[PDB]
Ligand binder design. Structure first.
Ligand code: SF4
Length: 76
């Protein structure tokens, strides 16, 4: 389970770890990782990440600030 939780960690969207440039698909790409990464269980990486970014989370997945930007733009 632990490796699986971090399986989706690295198996998410590189766009979630890297801020989008000027493309739109990046939002859809990022958005995909966002749903798959957010619905995945929790790991020490998830808790440690939230503390590093000061984000209130525990049951959900880990998401970067740039990632949230990609999401808001995706919804428009
Ligand atoms: S939700 Fe947390 S444990 Fe799951 S892949 Fe994303 S960062 Fe890793």
């Amino acid at each position: 389970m632990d490796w699986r939780h971090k399986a989706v960690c690295r198996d998410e969207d590189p766009e979630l770890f890297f801020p989008v440039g000027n493309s739109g698909p990046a939002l859809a790409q990022i958005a995909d990782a966002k749903l798959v990464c957010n619905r995945c269980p929790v790991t020490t990486e998830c808790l440690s990440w939230a503390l590093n970014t000061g984000q209130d989370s525990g049951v959900w997945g880990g998401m970067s600030e740039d990632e949230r930007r990609a999401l808001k733009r995706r919804n428009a």
